[PDB]
Design a protein around this nucleic acid. Sequence first.
RNA 1: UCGGAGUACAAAAAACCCUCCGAGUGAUUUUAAUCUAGACAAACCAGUCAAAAUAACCAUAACAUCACUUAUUGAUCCAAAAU
Lengths: 48, 74, 354, 52, 92, 31, 143, 49, 95
Amino acid sequence: KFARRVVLLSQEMDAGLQAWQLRQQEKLQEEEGKQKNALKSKGALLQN
Amino acid sequence: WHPGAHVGLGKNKCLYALEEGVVRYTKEVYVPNPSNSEAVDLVTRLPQGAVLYKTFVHVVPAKPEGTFKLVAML
Amino acid sequence: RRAAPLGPMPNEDIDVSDLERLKKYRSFDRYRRRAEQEARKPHWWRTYREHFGEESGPKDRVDIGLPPPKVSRTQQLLERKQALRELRANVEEERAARLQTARIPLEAVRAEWERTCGPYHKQRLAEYCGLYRDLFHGATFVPRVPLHVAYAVGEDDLMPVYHGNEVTPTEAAQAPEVTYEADEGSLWTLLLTNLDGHLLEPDAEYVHWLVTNIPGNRVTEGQETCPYLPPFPARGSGFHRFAFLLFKQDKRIDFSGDTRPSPCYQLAQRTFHTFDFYKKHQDAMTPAGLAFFQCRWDDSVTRVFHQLLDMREPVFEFVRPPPYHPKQKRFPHRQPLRYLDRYRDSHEPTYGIY
Amino acid sequence: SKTILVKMMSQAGTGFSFNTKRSRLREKLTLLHYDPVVKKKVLFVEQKKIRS
Amino acid sequence: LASADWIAEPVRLKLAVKHKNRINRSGELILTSECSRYQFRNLADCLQKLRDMIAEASQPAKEPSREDAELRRSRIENMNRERLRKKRISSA
Amino acid sequence: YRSKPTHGIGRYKHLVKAQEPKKKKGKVEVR
Amino acid sequence: PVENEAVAPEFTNRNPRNLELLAVARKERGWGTVWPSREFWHRLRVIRTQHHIEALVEHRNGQVVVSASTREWAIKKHLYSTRNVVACESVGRVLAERCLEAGINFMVYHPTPWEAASDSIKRLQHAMTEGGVVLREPRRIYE
Amino acid sequence: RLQYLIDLGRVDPTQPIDLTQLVNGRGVTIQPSKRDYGVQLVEEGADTF
Amino acid sequence: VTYFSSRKGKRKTVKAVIYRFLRLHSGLWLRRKAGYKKKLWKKTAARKRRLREFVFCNKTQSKLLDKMTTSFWKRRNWYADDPYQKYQDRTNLKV
RNA sequence: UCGGAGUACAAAAAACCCUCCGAGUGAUUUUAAUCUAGACAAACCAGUCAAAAUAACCAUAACAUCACUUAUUGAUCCAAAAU
Ligand SMILES: [K+]
Ligand SMILES: [Mg+2]
Ligand SMILES: [Mg+2]
Ligand SMILES: [Mg+2]
Ligand SMILES: [Mg+2]
């Protein structure tokens, strides 16, 4: 019973760490999506 | 605590929420009512670089005012 | 356990000692001006602007529009002052001004307001009504060119359409006329859309008019793509916003993929996405003008659903959330007799075995 | 100085009486109350002395 | 409504003028009730409501008016839109 | 509150003078 | 059946002014210990600097919708001085026209008590009343 | 309940029905001592009668 | 409370309770606020309204009054034109 | 018996034949309505606030004020008065 608890506790910590890394990549990939989704700013650049 | 947005004020200076939502506490500036002689006198004597700050209690509404539903299609 | 403040305290700049040397306010209208200027600063503590929807605070607005006209400030500064000196020296003006008896040519101010600061004032009107949010999302444009939309109602009466006005559908039954100053060296595109009013999809907008490749001022001579359709707001949900968009295009563009049939009455074919539409032809077109009005329900809407759209008229209603009540206790304590009425299901008495 | 409690009857004919505390040295009091029976403001006059 | 011959011709058209919001596309006047749980009372309410509709429309002299809180702003927003309408220039 | 970093944000009595009220018995031009 | 008859049971209106124009939107009731009261949809803000007169119409979010001030070159070249009683009238008349053009017909003005008796502010509201813009916003329905 | 009694033969509509027939049908029980003055007809089942 | 009477041997009731309480068939008891007729000129408008309202009794008071009265007053009564007739039975009580 | 400050230093509560102030009402008119969501407080009895709605009156008008404003007060039964 003790050994199974060690395996369960070791996997949950490892699985929880993987989830955080996925969110960090997901947050960055979402940021670059907004940059590559808007419109080409004409603004004052038309006369520039 | 002075009342803020969506918060009433009873005759015994108790604060009660007017809308359903989340209670929030905030530090804001104090601009007294001109008809209050004692408060406006305190503001008058302040130096130019100072502003009164007081604490306020707010209630940010959660439920919307209402929604439109199809009642009849003639 | 005292903690250290995260930044400068508000009133720590002034010296507590030597109070008499510091000049006072002496007024109540000075404090209000000072307090309001202090209330708009980004303080490090929790503020009202933080919790009550400041719309993400500072936003990097994307500008997609014609560049502002090149004006020389040095020449403008001298001519503006020179013109004022001529008006200042007039004695008869002083006679009227002192005696509080003078008026101004509001029509003349209207013409000059449009040319000088009209585009900037119209920009915040669209932002306030969220036209940019529902059309270009974060992107915004300055309505540089003036635009005039008017409806022919009577024999000679002319209902105008300004920014954020209100027009009854009866006035808008017929197609309007658009007048704007432009030379015969470029092309323009006119687009009228119903931002809210789509039935199945809430994020889509209908199209009521679309004229393509307009040669200069004459709108009629331009190629027609989508025919005019009178506004048809629902009876329940009122005040739909209809926006006129003017696009300036460099080259003759092939606006054939968006062509609609002539007696187009299928609302599924009127589905439109301005951001998607502007995405395809972003290189050629450029927004230049804007004019939008509010529109509620009237009797003339009914015939549109029946005769024109061949549709049963849908009627909505504003429904409020049901009242909130606490969980019912078996033995209410010091509660009025009406405590039972709150949780009653129906007022019709219901007998059981009897 | 002692005050007097007097009952005031409506002058609108309806039977409506509310008590009011009054100073003893003052003369007969006459007020402008609001009786719900007529749902309108009507004159009220002092009628009887009840409590001192 | 058109073929309902138990009402007079002036009464029939006055119902369409006032109650045009309840008229279906096919000319079918629709009246609905939700008050009581028993359908006998619901039908009785509809009949009494229909009698009142006919009774007030039947009388030519019956033309009551009223003032409401929404009527004030409706008049103001109507008056304000007439300010811009006053210009009279050649149209399209 | 004491422990919060925003403690003492409402302090004002050190901005204005004490302004001793003219007491009925202590009314005197103490110069 | 008819493909054109499909209607969603719930209709979503994205117009921010739809609730405001229907007099069903929430007014920010409360405060009371401060001034001015922030229970409004639109507020008229009149600022009288020693050189110019500025009038603002603000939403409760802090944004300014329509503004008419003597600092504009359009109004400056038609007025003799920007700090007269007549200058306030011109600001009032110009703002009244713009508010009608912007569709704003109701607003709340809370003047300082001494400004309420001032000659310029008294006649400024007269221009607004005759300009078509009506103070005293309508009461909220089911407040 | 009046419809329920008739369907099960507790009372019959061929013969006139009064308070006595209801008691013999065990439909209602009347206690004269407890100031009971009879039976009142309610409209709980008017739709399916 | 006389648990066993000396004449019939049954359980008596306390007449003080019935003269000033009303028992609904759901077990809830009804009573008037104390002091609703004393010194009305002294009390405010809100206070007088609160004292004129009927109120319920909590579990201990309700349980106490059930042991002081006999079983005749707990019966089901069908009065003619009874204002409280619709309050007799509880409804939509999720305990 | 009732209120305020300290003891009880920062949510609430917290004692002594503990240390100090008070209350058992006046002045004035703005004479202060009816009805109901939701809560604070509390052994019980009591005490407090209160949106919406209706009426009153600027014709889309509810906090009586001031005196440290906080305390200025008494349950049934019973008696008297118009009810
Ligand atoms: K929509
Ligand atoms: Mg029985
Ligand atoms: Mg509690
Ligand atoms: Mg109210
Ligand atoms: Mg006794």
